Amino acid sequence: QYWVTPLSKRQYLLKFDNRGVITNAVDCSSSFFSEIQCKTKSLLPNTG
Amino acid sequence: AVYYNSWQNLLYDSNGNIIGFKDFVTNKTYNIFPCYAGRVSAAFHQNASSLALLYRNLKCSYVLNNISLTTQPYFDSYLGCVFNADNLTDYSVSSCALRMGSGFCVDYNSYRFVTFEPFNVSFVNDSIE
Amino acid sequence: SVGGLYEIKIPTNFTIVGQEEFIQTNSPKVTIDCSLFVCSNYAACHDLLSEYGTFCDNINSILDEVNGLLDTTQLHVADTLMQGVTLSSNLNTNLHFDVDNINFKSLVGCLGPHCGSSSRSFFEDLLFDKVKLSDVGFVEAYNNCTGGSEIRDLLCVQSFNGIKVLPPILSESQISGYTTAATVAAMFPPWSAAAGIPFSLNVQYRINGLGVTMDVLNKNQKLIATAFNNALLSIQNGFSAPNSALAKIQSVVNSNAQALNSLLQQLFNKFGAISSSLQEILSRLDPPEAQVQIDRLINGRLTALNAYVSQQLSDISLVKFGAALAMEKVNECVKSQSPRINFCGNGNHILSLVQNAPYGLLFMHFSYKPISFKTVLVSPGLCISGDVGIAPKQGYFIKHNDHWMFTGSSYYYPEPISDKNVVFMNTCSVNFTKAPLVY
Amino acid sequence: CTGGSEIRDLLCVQSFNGIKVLPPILSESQISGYTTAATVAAMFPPWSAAAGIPFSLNVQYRINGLGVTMDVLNKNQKLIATAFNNALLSIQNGFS
Amino acid sequence: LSEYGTFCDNINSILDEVNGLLDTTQLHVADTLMQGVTLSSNLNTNLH
Amino acid sequence: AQVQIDRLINGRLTALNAYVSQQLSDISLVKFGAALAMEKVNECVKSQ
Amino acid sequence: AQVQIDRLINGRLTALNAYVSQQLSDISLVKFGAALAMEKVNECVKSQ
Amino acid sequence: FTGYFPKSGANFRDLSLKGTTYLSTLWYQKPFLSDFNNGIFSRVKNTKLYVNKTLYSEFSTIVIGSVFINNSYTIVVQPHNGVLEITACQYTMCEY
Ligand SMILES: CC(=O)N[C@H]1[C@H]([C@H](O)[C@H](O)COC(C)=O)O[C@@](O[C@H](CO)[C@@H](O)[C@@H]2O[C@@](O)(C(=O)O)C[C@H](O)[C@H]2NC(C)=O)(C(=O)O)C[C@@H]1O
Ligand SMILES: *[C@@H]1O[C@H](CO)[C@@H](O[C@@H]2O[C@H](CO)[C@@H](O)[C@H](O)[C@H]2NC(C)=O)[C@H](O)[C@H]1NC(C)=O
Ligand SMILES: *[C@@H]1O[C@H](CO)[C@@H](O[C@@H]2O[C@H](CO)[C@@H](O)[C@H](O)[C@H]2NC(C)=O)[C@H](O)[C@H]1NC(C)=O
Ligand SMILES: *[C@@H]1O[C@H](CO)[C@@H](O[C@@H]2O[C@H](CO)[C@@H](O)[C@H](O)[C@H]2NC(C)=O)[C@H](O)[C@H]1NC(C)=O
Ligand SMILES: *[C@@H]1O[C@H](CO)[C@@H](O)[C@H](O)[C@H]1NC(C)=O
Ligand SMILES: *[C@@H]1O[C@H](CO)[C@@H](O)[C@H](O)[C@H]1NC(C)=O
Ligand SMILES: *[C@@H]1O[C@H](CO)[C@@H](O)[C@H](O)[C@H]1NC(C)=O
Ligand SMILES: *[C@@H]1O[C@H](CO)[C@@H](O)[C@H](O)[C@H]1NC(C)=O
Ligand SMILES: *[C@@H]1O[C@H](CO)[C@@H](O)[C@H](O)[C@H]1NC(C)=O
């Protein structure tokens, strides 16, 4: 298996843990929920 | 520190500031903190020939060892190091032109660091029962 | 109306309900050093900032006036709490904490200067330990900025960038001493904050004024006192769960922390310049172009300060309004009972009490709450004897045992009609029920 | 704004440029329901918004409290009620 | 505009707070209108 | 084009800042008026 | 000359916006003070 | 952070091809021969085989280039059982 996908210049929300490892990420322009996650700079935005 | 991998030598905060690094030669790791920055709260009375200085939230040892040495008398108040004022918090004043915060005042005759008590109860010696 | 009577649900039993209300009377006294915020330590920035001249003098002056308004407001609130308070020197809160079966031990701190700063009630202790950034909280947080700790407290970064919150002119311990004095002034003679009469009698007369006969009040005094201290306990236990008043108190600290953090984030905005860092600009460009980039940062940071100062002026206007309302509630709900229906909280307001809270005052409004109701037929007036009209005072006329009697509007207790509970008229109005056999 | 209208509403230009007025959390119809409930609460039992007594008696006691004897006040009840409804009609006609 | 940083976030945040104050105020006015209001279930708009 | 667009961004952001400042000031008067209206409801309609 | 005059225009206009925002806040306080004065006239002078 | 990243919600394409003896000429045309544009992100399965219980790692080799003629540099990323050989040379690439 050799899965490939195109790359492009995109803005991402990168979350780093207490040891410097990227544990989670969000593609900001991918969907409406991703836009809320990037706007609030959090993986689980507050109810609103 | 244990978070630096083989290719990493700089630690950054969420704002893009350098806050730590690993020395390329000695491999020793250090945290970088900003140098102290602050203000001096100076209390002045027109009849005085000097000032009462308050280094807010700073111990007098810190002021003398890391900011500046001086010949003025000093003491550690609740609000921070106070210079050129006598510690007289046991005394109180109902009016105060130099209000320093948390019920403290600077009173000039020298300057006195005194408690500020603008209001008090009218007392009577009548029975409670 | 059947004949001349209407159907009304009159209470047959009641309880006392306590309601909290936090009124913000103060806010953190934010000070900006405009020079240190805009330019940090960089001489090339300070030279340019001098050419903007009076912009930093305006930022400093407007915030000094705003902080002066907050200090004047705090003195006015303290003056209001202590206005007319007279206490006996024989009063010792360690032994004197309950009277007439009503317990104020939780609402009263130690009294007198021998305690020092310990003049805070159990109620205020329980309300202050849930808020980290109170006046003492800010002082302790700023004290830790030079403690050499590895923890990067956001308040320390803000203060090093010239953004520091100063303590209020009166500590929250002094204000708790003033609320304690105002509270004991209602429990013991001369009762200077309880209409000059015992607290239980003031509660009884206030409940009677709602349309409750005094006969049930002076025999249910134990039940009234137990309902009153149970309402107080319900208020105290309400802070251990999601509470609207505690959330309102925490909103003051959260909104201030959000505004200060938002102001600090302006130091990382590029404002169209090559970098948000003055060190990077000065290490990449010479004076002819570095000054252009530094001027972009100066305009952006000064614009951010003018916006923050406009927001602070608006917020302090709201705090002055809230402090005026709190002073009015002290005077017209705690020290006295003004004839205004829903001013001191909702419902049949009996009486109110006050306690100190972070950046404000917490009022406890006690109300007469009906438990059970009886549907009865009432007459709003009667035409008696020689066509003389009578109207009931804070009650209704009732046919009890096929005889006309009076009952209070807030408690069903039929009692004989007399000049004590009647308004007389020389002529009776139309539709007043005809009763020639009365009096 | 999305209709096939030839009329250029200035609000549509504002909304397309990012400036828009959002509706309040409670519709004005709900507030009208609340003012209606507050008004009928004074007319009928238990008169929860009229001191617990009939509206006409509340008007009569309020006028008496100004220094008007209850005799002329209860003998002229229809004149007072007609003056009250004429005042209400005058307020309604004043909007024209 | 992305190089200006938080300017548009500040404008949106201040307007959202202002609108939250208007919403809270409208709820307080509605609560005040409805406070203590008791009506009979027998009330009818077409008869009374 | 960046120089020209930057002048427009600065003007438009300054205009939004001015409008937001005016909106905060006007909502303070609206809150004051709403408090007066709640007081008039309680002390003129529900009671005298 | 246009470049230098533009710097002065932006500074003078920025200062005029700051003064206008301060004036709006101060007049809101004057309106609150006048409302309190009218209440004192009506409830302390003309009546008690 | 802004960088060269995949589009979330887009589709990966498994371009790996396994043969035994015969090679299809269609395997060397579109859509297998894909445009590079800015770049690509690869998620590669490490096909862990065993001979006499001894583990061996195999996966598809990728070539990146333009015309694949010795007038041009072709980058080649090829595994050698734990060793990833990466070269960029003027290779005479085969037709297949
Ligand atoms: C891209 C693709 O579709 N790839 C599949 C491949 C092709 O379709 C086939 O190569 C095309 O052929 C053309 C172009 O002519 O088929 C595979 O499966 C075969 C059966 O389809 C496989 O079982 C083989 O079967 C044999 O009968 C035979 O020779 O094909 C005997 C041989 O020993 C045995 N190989 C072993 C033992 O690996 C394979 O592998 O080749 C699985 C691959 O995923
Ligand atoms: C500092 O740390 C680096 C990284 O671990 C050390 O570099 C390694 O040194 C050994 C011995 O020469 C080599 O086998 C590795 O290949 C080196 N790794 C890299 C990434 O260069 C370095 O020796 C350390 N130096 C000191 C003074 O501690
Ligand atoms: C500043 O003055 C106060 C008041 O005299 C000092 O506090 C007292 O300290 C003594 C011990 O020396 C205690 O017995 C008292 O109970 C304290 N009183 C109070 C009100 O706390 C204080 O220690 C002095 N501080 C310095 C640094 O001189
Ligand atoms: C009436 O007076 C008595 C005597 O002063 C009061 O009785 C005390 O009440 C407290 C509770 O507040 C008890 O803990 C004490 O033990 C009681 N003492 C005695 C000697 O009985 C009583 O509370 C008063 N009641 C009212 C309603 O005025
Ligand atoms: C200051 O000096 C003036 C003039 O002698 C005097 O009126 C005033 O009372 C003095 N105040 C104090 C605090 O010394
Ligand atoms: C309040 O304190 C001051 C200073 O100790 C004193 O002059 C004043 O007389 C006190 N108040 C009363 C009511 O005695
Ligand atoms: C109270 O004070 C007055 C005035 O000094 C004195 O006459 C009286 O005897 C005192 N009474 C008590 C119980 O201390
Ligand atoms: C009133 O209500 C309480 C709680 O339900 C009850 O304990 C008490 O006995 C009741 N009293 C009467 C007179 O109904
Ligand atoms: C201040 O520092 C001390 C010692 O590290 C710590 O115990 C305390 O919790 C800190 N308090 C605050 C408010 O930072």
Which protein residues touch ligand 5 with a CB less than 6 Å away? B 47, 108
Q: Evaluate whether C120 touches C173 at the Cβ level (below 8 Å).
A: yes
DSSP assignment of C292-339 equals HHHHHHHHHHHHHHHHHHHHHHHHHHHHHHHHHHHHHHIIIIIS---S
Q: Evaluate whether C188 touches C194 at the Cβ level (below 8 Å).
A: no
Q: How far apart are CA G28 and CA G7, in angstroms?
A: 32
Atom of ligand 5 nearest to the CA of B47: 1
Vertex E48 angle, CA D88 and D55, to 5°: 55
For this entry, resolution in Å reads 3.1
The dihedral through the CA atoms of C128, C129, C130, C133 has a sign that is positive
Q: How close F43 comes to chain D (CA, Å)?
A: 11
Q: Evaluate whether C383 touches C434 at the Cβ level (below 8 Å).
A: yes
User: Is there an atom of ligand 3 within 6 Å of B50 CB?
Assistant: no
Atom of ligand 4 nearest to the CA of C221: 27
Contact yes or no, B with F (3+ CB pairs under 8 Å): no
Neighbouring chains of E at 3+ CB pairs under 8 Å are C, D, F
Minimum Cα–Cα distance from A5: chain H residue: H12
Written as six digits, the tokens of C165 are: 């919150």
Q: What is the DSSP letter of C271?
A: T
**Residue C173: partners with Cβ closer than 8 Å, 6 or more residues away:** B103, C117, C119, C120
Q: Evaluate whether C49 touches C60 at the Cβ level (below 8 Å).
A: no
Q: How far apart are CA G8 and CA C99, in angstroms?
A: 72
The answer to whether the Cβ–Cβ distance between E10 and C270 falls below 8 Å is no
Atom of ligand 4 nearest to the CA of C225: 27
Q: Which residue has the tokens 């790692």?
A: H57
Q: How close C429 comes to chain D (CA, Å)?
A: 5
Q: How close F40 comes to chain C (CA, Å)?
A: 11
Q: Residue D24 — left, alpha, or beta (φ > 0 → left; ψ -120 to 50 → alpha)? A: beta
Find the Cα–Cα–Cα–Cα dihedral B14, B20, B24, B27, rounded to 10°: -130
**What pairs with residue C86 in β-bridges?**
B122
Tell me if chain C has a CB within 8 Å of the CB of E10.
yes
Radius of gyration in angstroms for the set of CA atoms belonging to chain E, rounded to a whole number = 21
3-class SS at B77?
Answer: strand
**Residue C369: partners with Cβ closer than 8 Å, 6 or more residues away:** C14, C15, C16, C17, C347, C348
Written as six digits, the tokens of H75 are: 């980058």
β-pair type (C433-434, C382-384)? parallel
Any idea how long chain D is? Answer: 96
User: Is there an atom of ligand 1 within 6 Å of H96 CB?
Assistant: no
Q: Residue B80 — left, alpha, or beta (φ > 0 → left; ψ -120 to 50 → alpha)? A: left
Cα distances (angstroms) measured from residue C188 to each of C90, C102, C365, D61 = 11, 12, 20, 39
The answer to whether the Cβ–Cβ distance between B15 and C265 falls below 8 Å is yes
**What pairs with residue C396 in β-bridges?**
C407
| Helices of type H across chain D | 10-16, 28-43, 55-64, 70-75, 77-94
**What pairs with residue C202 in β-bridges?**
none
Any idea how long chain B is? Answer: 129
Q: How far apart are CA C192 and CA C190, in angstroms?
A: 5
For residue C369, give the amino acid letter.
K
Contact yes or no, D with A (3+ CB pairs under 8 Å): no
Vertex C49 angle, CA C47 and C52, to 5°: 125
For residue C167, the CA-to-ligand 7 centroid distance in Å is 41
The answer to whether the Cβ–Cβ distance between D41 and E43 falls below 8 Å is no
Find the Cα–Cα–Cα–Cα dihedral F31, F37, F41, F45, rounded to 10°: 180
Q: Evaluate whether B22 touches B8 at the Cβ level (below 8 Å).
A: yes
Q: How far apart are CA C347 and CA B57, in angstroms?
A: 47
For residue C287, give the amino acid letter.
P
Nearest CB to E5 within list C269, C307, C342: C269
3-class SS at E35?
Answer: coil
Minimum Cα–Cα distance from D22: chain E residue: E19
Tell me if chain G has a CB within 8 Å of the CB of F37.
no
Q: Evaluate whether C29 touches C267 at the Cβ level (below 8 Å).
A: no
Residues of chain A with Cβ-Cβ distance to H79 below 8 Å are: none
CB atoms within 10 A of CB C211: 21
Atom of ligand 9 nearest to the CA of C132: 13
3-class SS at C205?
Answer: helix
CA H95 to chain centroid: 16
User: Is there an atom of ligand 3 within 6 Å of B78 CB?
Assistant: no
Three-state SS sequence of C211-260: CCCHHHHCCCHHHHHHHHHHHHHHHHHHCCCCCHHHHHHHHHHHHHHHHH
Atom of ligand 2 nearest to the CA of B27: 1
CB atoms within 10 A of CB H27: 12
Vertex C418 angle, CA C415 and C419, to 5°: 145
Tell me if chain C has a CB within 8 Å of the CB of D42.
no
Residues of chain E with Cβ-Cβ distance to C269 below 8 Å are: 4-7
Q: How far apart are CA B59 and CA B81, in angstroms?
A: 5
- Return phi, psi of residue H19, to 5°: -125, 165
Tell me if chain C has a CB within 8 Å of the CB of G23.
no
Written as six digits, the tokens of B80 are: 């921070």
β-pair type (C86-88, B122-124)? parallel
Minimum Cα–Cα distance from F29: chain G residue: G28
**What pairs with residue B104 in β-bridges?**
B101, B115
Tell me if chain B has a CB within 8 Å of the CB of A9.
no
Written as six digits, the tokens of A45 are: 């935005």
Q: What is the DSSP letter of E4?
A: G
Any idea how long chain G is? Answer: 48
Q: How far apart are CA H40 and CA A39, in angstroms?
A: 27
Residues of chain B with Cβ-Cβ distance to C96 below 8 Å are: 128
Q: How far apart are CA A35 and CA A41, in angstroms?
A: 10
Q: Evaluate whether C127 touches C355 at the Cβ level (below 8 Å).
A: yes
DSSP element (H, E) containing F18? helix F2-40
Report how far apart the first and last C-alpha atoms of chain A are (Å, whole number). 42
Q: Look at ligand 4, atom 4, and give the residue with the nearest C-alpha.
A: C100
Q: How close B6 comes to chain A (CA, Å)?
A: 13
Any idea how long chain F is? Answer: 48
For residue B93, the CA-to-ligand 6 centroid distance in Å is 9
β-pair type (C411-415, A2-16)? unpaired
User: Is there an atom of ligand 3 within 6 Å of B76 CB?
Assistant: yes
- Return phi, psi of residue B91, to 5°: -90, 155
3-class SS at C373?
Answer: strand
Q: Evaluate whether H74 touches H65 at the Cβ level (below 8 Å).
A: yes
Upstream peptide bond of A6 is cis (omega within 30 degrees of 0)? no
The answer to whether the Cβ–Cβ distance between C55 and G29 falls below 8 Å is no
DSSP assignment of C115-137 equals G-S----HHHHHHHTT-SSSHHH
Q: What is the DSSP letter of D76?
A: T
Tell me if chain C has a CB within 8 Å of the CB of B103.
yes
Burial string for D33-65 (b: 16+ CB within 10 Å, else e) reads ebeebbebbbebbbbbbbbbbbbbbbbbbeebe
Query: In terms of C-beta density within 10 A (0-12 exposed, 13-18 middle, 19 or more buried), how is residue A44 classed?
Result: exposed
User: Is there an atom of ligand 6 within 6 Å of B95 CB?
Assistant: no
Written as six digits, the tokens of C439 are: 């009096």
- Within a 13 Å sphere around the CA of C265, how many CA atoms are in the beta-carbon half? 15
Radius of gyration in angstroms for the set of CA atoms belonging to chain A, rounded to a whole number = 13
Instruction: Give the long-range contacts of residues E13-22, CB within 8 A, separation 24 or more.
Output: E13/C262, E14/C311, E14/F20, E14/F23, E14/F24, E15/F20, E15/F23, E18/F23, E18/F24, E18/F27, E19/D22, E21/F27, E21/F31, E22/D24, E22/F27, E22/F30
Neighbouring chains of H at 3+ CB pairs under 8 Å are A
β-pair type (A2-16, H13-14)? antiparallel
Q: Evaluate whether B86 touches B113 at the Cβ level (below 8 Å).
A: yes
Q: Evaluate whether C199 touches C186 at the Cβ level (below 8 Å).
A: yes
Cα distances (angstroms) measured from residue G12 to each of C47, C220, E10, G16 = 20, 73, 24, 6
Contact yes or no, G with B (3+ CB pairs under 8 Å): no
User: Is there an atom of ligand 1 within 6 Å of H33 CB?
Assistant: no
Vertex C310 angle, CA C305 and C313, to 5°: 120
Any idea how long chain C is? Answer: 439
Which protein residues touch ligand 4 with a CB less than 6 Å away? C 98-101, 200, 221
**Residue H27: partners with Cβ closer than 8 Å, 6 or more residues away:** H17, H19, H96
Report how far apart the first and last C-alpha atoms of chain E are (Å, whole number). 62
DSSP assignment of C76-95 equals HHHHHHHTT-EEETT--TTT
- Return phi, psi of residue C432, to 5°: -70, 130
Q: Look at ligand 1, atom 16, and give the residue with the nearest C-alpha.
A: H19
**Residue A44: partners with Cβ closer than 8 Å, 6 or more residues away:** none
Any idea how long chain E is? Answer: 48
CB atoms within 10 A of CB C438: 17
DSSP assignment of C408-424 equals ETTEEEEE---GGGEEE
The dihedral through the CA atoms of D41, D46, D49, D54 has a sign that is positive
Q: Look at ligand 4, atom 26, and give the residue with the nearest C-alpha.
A: C100
Q: Evaluate whether C32 touches C59 at the Cβ level (below 8 Å).
A: yes
Tell me if chain D has a CB within 8 Å of the CB of F45.
yes
Instruction: Give the long-range contacts of residues G34-38, CB within 8 A, separation 24 or more.
Output: G35/F32, G35/F36, G36/C324
**Residue B40: partners with Cβ closer than 8 Å, 6 or more residues away:** B53, B54, B55
Any idea how long chain A is? Answer: 48
Tell me if chain C has a CB within 8 Å of the CB of D65.
no
Q: How close F42 comes to chain D (CA, Å)?
A: 9
Q: Residue C271 — left, alpha, or beta (φ > 0 → left; ψ -120 to 50 → alpha)? A: left
Q: Which among C100, C102, C197, C224 is the best mutation to test ligand 4's pocket, defined by most ligand atoms within 8 Å of the CB? A: C100
CB atoms within 10 A of CB B5: 9
Q: How far apart are CA C205 and CA C199, in angstroms?
A: 10
Nearest CB to G25 within list F14, F25, F32: F25
Q: Evaluate whether A43 touches A24 at the Cβ level (below 8 Å).
A: yes
Written as six digits, the tokens of C272 are: 């169209």
- Return phi, psi of residue B18, to 5°: -75, 120
Residues of chain C with Cβ-Cβ distance to B119 below 8 Å are: 78-79, 81-82, 178
Report how far apart the first and last C-alpha atoms of chain G are (Å, whole number). 67
DSSP element (H, E) containing C183? helix C172-187
Q: How far apart are CA C79 and CA C330, in angstroms?
A: 11
Written as six digits, the tokens of B39 are: 């203000």
Residues of chain C with Cβ-Cβ distance to E13 below 8 Å are: 262
**What pairs with residue C374 in β-bridges?**
C10
3-class SS at D19?
Answer: coil
**What pairs with residue C373 in β-bridges?**
C11
For residue C339, give the amino acid letter.
P
Report how far apart the first and last C-alpha atoms of chain D are (Å, whole number). 31
Q: Which residue has the tokens 């006239």?
A: G41
Nearest CB to G32 within list C303, C306, C321: C321
